[PDB]
Amino acid sequence: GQLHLEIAKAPDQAPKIAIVPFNNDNGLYPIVETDLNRSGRFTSSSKNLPANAAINQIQASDWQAAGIPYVVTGQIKQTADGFEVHYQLYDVQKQQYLLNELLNVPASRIRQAGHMVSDAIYQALTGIPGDFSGRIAYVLRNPATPAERYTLQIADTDGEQPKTVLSSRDPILSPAWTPDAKKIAYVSFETKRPAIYLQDLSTGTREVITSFKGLNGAPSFSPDGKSMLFTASMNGNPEIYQMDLSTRQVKRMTNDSGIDTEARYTPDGKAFIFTSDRGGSPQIYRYDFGNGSVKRLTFKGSFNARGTLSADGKKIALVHRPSGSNYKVAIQDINTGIVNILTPTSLDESPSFSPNGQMVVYATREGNRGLLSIMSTDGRFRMNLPSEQGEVREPAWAPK
């Protein structure tokens, strides 16, 4: 675990979830209790318990007395492959089970099993798919390690189980997830000329998507899996290009505005958003594939840039700078245009929505540490992913 997990701002008040230590536990329930405490919507505990419950044995009179609305029980039984977990979620007020599930775990796949159990608990309580399962890509930058100055890594949502995709003495920029999260793309300078690579995460193998003199990078993949957007400045100023994956057909679309830009597809495949200085200030515009029109989306402030789309397609995470203060991570509703400032940030860098749209990851700096921060979109939960050394940049939450 290169990125270690911190909770910075717990939700002020949230329902509590009691989790009874599973009999013959494998180390599973502490992971579940930790996930529930980083859900941004609940808190959980397993130590100072007011009662004693188990599988198919719970009495709600004592859990109400302690003001506990939700209780989780479990049973672990070893199998030939690995172990089984039989877990339940009990609603105390309704006096009924919200979950009664068995999950087969194949041997040393314990952290993924706890995230699955926690994902089911979260969905049973909020109706929103949990995001404790899933991966986040990031680039570790350490000039105090010239051999691995840049390292592209993929880790779990808590930073555990990191997987190094590529390390190099040269810049590695802008990791972008393929629609089904089976492949990852990135801009590499391991050879002097920048090149967008496409790396199969199953077999390992990579391939050069494009590579020339004016390539800026910032890749983004079409929801249909057929096209890719990227930034490149053949001469002078960066511009947005769309590639067709089948024939490597490149042809340009929009911005020759004098600032660096990045294009991000809308999840419906109808359009993409991008940053533009064509109005005299960096704003987020929307290019419609249908008629080729460009429309401004952000109107508040003198600086709106580095926008990304929520999977549902109704929210935009962006970098917002009121001319008085510095960079802020902001959320704008697409339907209504209401801009929600989430938090200050130290880096003019793109945020990334979680698949459920309830979380957002971004790169910032606190103290002398370059770290990743995960915040709930409503602004009450902060989660920190600091590095032991160097800085963490350009996160990309894997989609679902």
PDB file of C-alpha atoms in Angstrom, residues 32-167:
ATOM      1  CA  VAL A  32     -16.324  -4.061   6.377  1.00  0.00           C
ATOM      2  CA  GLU A  33     -16.414  -1.862   9.486  1.00  0.00           C
ATOM      3  CA  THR A  34     -13.710   0.320   7.924  1.00  0.00           C
ATOM      4  CA  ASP A  35     -15.574   0.583   4.610  1.00  0.00           C
ATOM      5  CA  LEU A  36     -18.849   1.557   6.293  1.00  0.00           C
ATOM      6  CA  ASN A  37     -16.974   4.262   8.219  1.00  0.00           C
ATOM      7  CA  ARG A  38     -15.637   5.663   4.919  1.00  0.00           C
ATOM      8  CA  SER A  39     -19.005   5.544   3.111  1.00  0.00           C
ATOM      9  CA  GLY A  40     -19.658   9.253   3.685  1.00  0.00           C
ATOM     10  CA  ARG A  41     -23.181   8.365   4.848  1.00  0.00           C
ATOM     11  CA  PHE A  42     -22.784   6.090   7.896  1.00  0.00           C
ATOM     12  CA  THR A  43     -20.604   5.212  10.863  1.00  0.00           C
ATOM     13  CA  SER A  44     -19.890   1.717  12.154  1.00  0.00           C
ATOM     14  CA  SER A  45     -18.478   0.070  15.266  1.00  0.00           C
ATOM     15  CA  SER A  46     -17.793  -3.416  16.597  1.00  0.00           C
ATOM     16  CA  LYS A  47     -16.176  -3.020  20.037  1.00  0.00           C
ATOM     17  CA  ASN A  48     -18.354  -1.312  22.678  1.00  0.00           C
ATOM     18  CA  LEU A  49     -21.398  -3.339  21.725  1.00  0.00           C
ATOM     19  CA  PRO A  50     -24.603  -3.221  23.797  1.00  0.00           C
ATOM     20  CA  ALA A  51     -25.897  -6.697  22.870  1.00  0.00           C
ATOM     21  CA  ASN A  52     -24.920 -10.012  21.261  1.00  0.00           C
ATOM     22  CA  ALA A  53     -26.460 -11.198  17.983  1.00  0.00           C
ATOM     23  CA  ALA A  54     -25.548 -13.718  15.293  1.00  0.00           C
ATOM     24  CA  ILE A  55     -26.876 -15.333  12.117  1.00  0.00           C
ATOM     25  CA  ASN A  56     -30.676 -15.707  12.283  1.00  0.00           C
ATOM     26  CA  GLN A  57     -30.582 -14.719  15.981  1.00  0.00           C
ATOM     27  CA  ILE A  58     -31.206 -11.060  16.832  1.00  0.00           C
ATOM     28  CA  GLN A  59     -33.628  -9.307  19.187  1.00  0.00           C
ATOM     29  CA  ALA A  60     -34.352  -5.676  18.336  1.00  0.00           C
ATOM     30  CA  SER A  61     -35.354  -4.516  21.835  1.00  0.00           C
ATOM     31  CA  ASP A  62     -31.726  -4.052  22.926  1.00  0.00           C
ATOM     32  CA  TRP A  63     -30.410  -2.428  19.743  1.00  0.00           C
ATOM     33  CA  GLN A  64     -33.094   0.253  19.872  1.00  0.00           C
ATOM     34  CA  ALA A  65     -32.190   0.898  23.515  1.00  0.00           C
ATOM     35  CA  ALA A  66     -28.661   1.857  22.442  1.00  0.00           C
ATOM     36  CA  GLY A  67     -30.023   3.927  19.551  1.00  0.00           C
ATOM     37  CA  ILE A  68     -28.699   1.462  16.960  1.00  0.00           C
ATOM     38  CA  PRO A  69     -30.854   1.167  13.804  1.00  0.00           C
ATOM     39  CA  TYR A  70     -28.764  -1.304  11.776  1.00  0.00           C
ATOM     40  CA  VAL A  71     -26.917  -4.456  12.860  1.00  0.00           C
ATOM     41  CA  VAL A  72     -24.682  -6.661  10.695  1.00  0.00           C
ATOM     42  CA  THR A  73     -23.937 -10.304  11.515  1.00  0.00           C
ATOM     43  CA  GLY A  74     -21.794 -12.894   9.783  1.00  0.00           C
ATOM     44  CA  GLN A  75     -20.443 -16.432   9.777  1.00  0.00           C
ATOM     45  CA  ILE A  76     -17.223 -17.595   8.099  1.00  0.00           C
ATOM     46  CA  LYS A  77     -16.700 -21.225   7.064  1.00  0.00           C
ATOM     47  CA  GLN A  78     -13.568 -22.420   5.287  1.00  0.00           C
ATOM     48  CA  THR A  79     -13.922 -24.199   1.939  1.00  0.00           C
ATOM     49  CA  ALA A  80     -11.566 -26.157  -0.306  1.00  0.00           C
ATOM     50  CA  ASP A  81     -10.809 -23.114  -2.462  1.00  0.00           C
ATOM     51  CA  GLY A  82     -10.971 -20.509   0.298  1.00  0.00           C
ATOM     52  CA  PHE A  83     -13.816 -19.580   2.626  1.00  0.00           C
ATOM     53  CA  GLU A  84     -17.514 -18.739   2.679  1.00  0.00           C
ATOM     54  CA  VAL A  85     -19.065 -15.677   4.316  1.00  0.00           C
ATOM     55  CA  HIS A  86     -22.729 -15.782   5.346  1.00  0.00           C
ATOM     56  CA  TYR A  87     -23.696 -12.235   6.318  1.00  0.00           C
ATOM     57  CA  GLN A  88     -26.931 -10.428   7.147  1.00  0.00           C
ATOM     58  CA  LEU A  89     -28.137  -6.841   7.468  1.00  0.00           C
ATOM     59  CA  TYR A  90     -30.904  -6.313  10.027  1.00  0.00           C
ATOM     60  CA  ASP A  91     -33.229  -3.309  10.101  1.00  0.00           C
ATOM     61  CA  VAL A  92     -34.063  -2.831  13.777  1.00  0.00           C
ATOM     62  CA  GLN A  93     -37.005  -0.423  13.472  1.00  0.00           C
ATOM     63  CA  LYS A  94     -38.694  -2.490  10.755  1.00  0.00           C
ATOM     64  CA  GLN A  95     -37.570  -5.688  12.559  1.00  0.00           C
ATOM     65  CA  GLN A  96     -36.606  -7.419   9.316  1.00  0.00           C
ATOM     66  CA  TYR A  97     -33.517  -8.447   7.369  1.00  0.00           C
ATOM     67  CA  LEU A  98     -32.372  -6.110   4.611  1.00  0.00           C
ATOM     68  CA  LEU A  99     -29.752  -8.635   3.453  1.00  0.00           C
ATOM     69  CA  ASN A 100     -29.260 -12.384   3.893  1.00  0.00           C
ATOM     70  CA  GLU A 101     -26.495 -13.381   1.497  1.00  0.00           C
ATOM     71  CA  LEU A 102     -23.673 -15.874   1.061  1.00  0.00           C
ATOM     72  CA  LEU A 103     -20.506 -14.907  -0.818  1.00  0.00           C
ATOM     73  CA  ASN A 104     -17.963 -17.514  -1.902  1.00  0.00           C
ATOM     74  CA  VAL A 105     -14.408 -16.199  -1.568  1.00  0.00           C
ATOM     75  CA  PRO A 106     -11.560 -17.916  -3.452  1.00  0.00           C
ATOM     76  CA  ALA A 107      -8.661 -18.161  -0.960  1.00  0.00           C
ATOM     77  CA  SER A 108      -6.576 -14.972  -0.422  1.00  0.00           C
ATOM     78  CA  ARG A 109      -9.149 -12.655  -1.992  1.00  0.00           C
ATOM     79  CA  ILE A 110     -10.215 -11.228   1.359  1.00  0.00           C
ATOM     80  CA  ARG A 111     -10.073  -7.461   0.766  1.00  0.00           C
ATOM     81  CA  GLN A 112     -12.313  -7.782  -2.299  1.00  0.00           C
ATOM     82  CA  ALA A 113     -14.815  -9.841  -0.290  1.00  0.00           C
ATOM     83  CA  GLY A 114     -15.119  -7.204   2.429  1.00  0.00           C
ATOM     84  CA  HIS A 115     -15.641  -4.505  -0.185  1.00  0.00           C
ATOM     85  CA  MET A 116     -18.370  -6.640  -1.778  1.00  0.00           C
ATOM     86  CA  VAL A 117     -20.152  -7.126   1.554  1.00  0.00           C
ATOM     87  CA  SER A 118     -19.861  -3.397   2.255  1.00  0.00           C
ATOM     88  CA  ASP A 119     -21.123  -2.599  -1.252  1.00  0.00           C
ATOM     89  CA  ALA A 120     -24.235  -4.690  -0.585  1.00  0.00           C
ATOM     90  CA  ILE A 121     -24.806  -3.055   2.812  1.00  0.00           C
ATOM     91  CA  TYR A 122     -24.508   0.414   1.268  1.00  0.00           C
ATOM     92  CA  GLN A 123     -26.956  -0.415  -1.529  1.00  0.00           C
ATOM     93  CA  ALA A 124     -29.446  -1.962   0.904  1.00  0.00           C
ATOM     94  CA  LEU A 125     -29.473   1.215   3.031  1.00  0.00           C
ATOM     95  CA  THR A 126     -29.364   3.955   0.369  1.00  0.00           C
ATOM     96  CA  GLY A 127     -30.475   2.305  -2.877  1.00  0.00           C
ATOM     97  CA  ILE A 128     -27.220   3.442  -4.516  1.00  0.00           C
ATOM     98  CA  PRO A 129     -24.564   0.966  -5.741  1.00  0.00           C
ATOM     99  CA  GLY A 130     -21.610   0.841  -3.387  1.00  0.00           C
ATOM    100  CA  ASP A 131     -18.173   1.882  -4.595  1.00  0.00           C
ATOM    101  CA  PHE A 132     -15.878   0.211  -2.051  1.00  0.00           C
ATOM    102  CA  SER A 133     -15.182  -2.312  -4.785  1.00  0.00           C
ATOM    103  CA  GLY A 134     -13.424  -0.745  -7.751  1.00  0.00           C
ATOM    104  CA  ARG A 135     -10.066   0.662  -8.727  1.00  0.00           C
ATOM    105  CA  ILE A 136      -8.452   4.097  -8.962  1.00  0.00           C
ATOM    106  CA  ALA A 137      -5.525   4.901 -11.246  1.00  0.00           C
ATOM    107  CA  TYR A 138      -2.932   7.527 -10.357  1.00  0.00           C
ATOM    108  CA  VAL A 139       0.592   8.674 -11.207  1.00  0.00           C
ATOM    109  CA  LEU A 140       3.212   8.873  -8.460  1.00  0.00           C
ATOM    110  CA  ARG A 141       5.823  11.569  -9.117  1.00  0.00           C
ATOM    111  CA  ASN A 142       9.089  11.336  -7.168  1.00  0.00           C
ATOM    112  CA  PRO A 143      12.137  13.290  -8.383  1.00  0.00           C
ATOM    113  CA  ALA A 144      13.942  11.794  -5.369  1.00  0.00           C
ATOM    114  CA  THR A 145      13.832   8.522  -7.346  1.00  0.00           C
ATOM    115  CA  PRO A 146      15.214   9.349 -10.803  1.00  0.00           C
ATOM    116  CA  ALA A 147      14.891   5.729 -11.956  1.00  0.00           C
ATOM    117  CA  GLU A 148      11.163   5.683 -11.159  1.00  0.00           C
ATOM    118  CA  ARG A 149      10.422   9.406 -11.429  1.00  0.00           C
ATOM    119  CA  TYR A 150       6.911   8.628 -12.708  1.00  0.00           C
ATOM    120  CA  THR A 151       4.954   5.492 -11.797  1.00  0.00           C
ATOM    121  CA  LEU A 152       1.493   4.679 -13.144  1.00  0.00           C
ATOM    122  CA  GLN A 153      -0.369   2.650 -10.519  1.00  0.00           C
ATOM    123  CA  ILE A 154      -3.851   1.215 -10.035  1.00  0.00           C
ATOM    124  CA  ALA A 155      -5.104   0.531  -6.513  1.00  0.00           C
ATOM    125  CA  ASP A 156      -8.335  -0.128  -4.656  1.00  0.00           C
ATOM    126  CA  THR A 157     -10.577   2.710  -3.499  1.00  0.00           C
ATOM    127  CA  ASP A 158      -8.766   2.635  -0.130  1.00  0.00           C
ATOM    128  CA  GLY A 159      -5.308   2.594  -1.740  1.00  0.00           C
ATOM    129  CA  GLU A 160      -4.633  -1.044  -0.855  1.00  0.00           C
ATOM    130  CA  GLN A 161      -3.340  -3.675  -3.280  1.00  0.00           C
ATOM    131  CA  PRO A 162      -1.511  -1.331  -5.684  1.00  0.00           C
ATOM    132  CA  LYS A 163      -0.682  -2.581  -9.170  1.00  0.00           C
ATOM    133  CA  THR A 164       2.139  -0.863 -11.053  1.00  0.00           C
ATOM    134  CA  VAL A 165       1.164  -0.465 -14.706  1.00  0.00           C
ATOM    135  CA  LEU A 166       4.362   1.308 -15.800  1.00  0.00           C
ATOM    136  CA  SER A 167       7.309   3.140 -14.249  1.00  0.00           C
TER     137      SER A 167
END
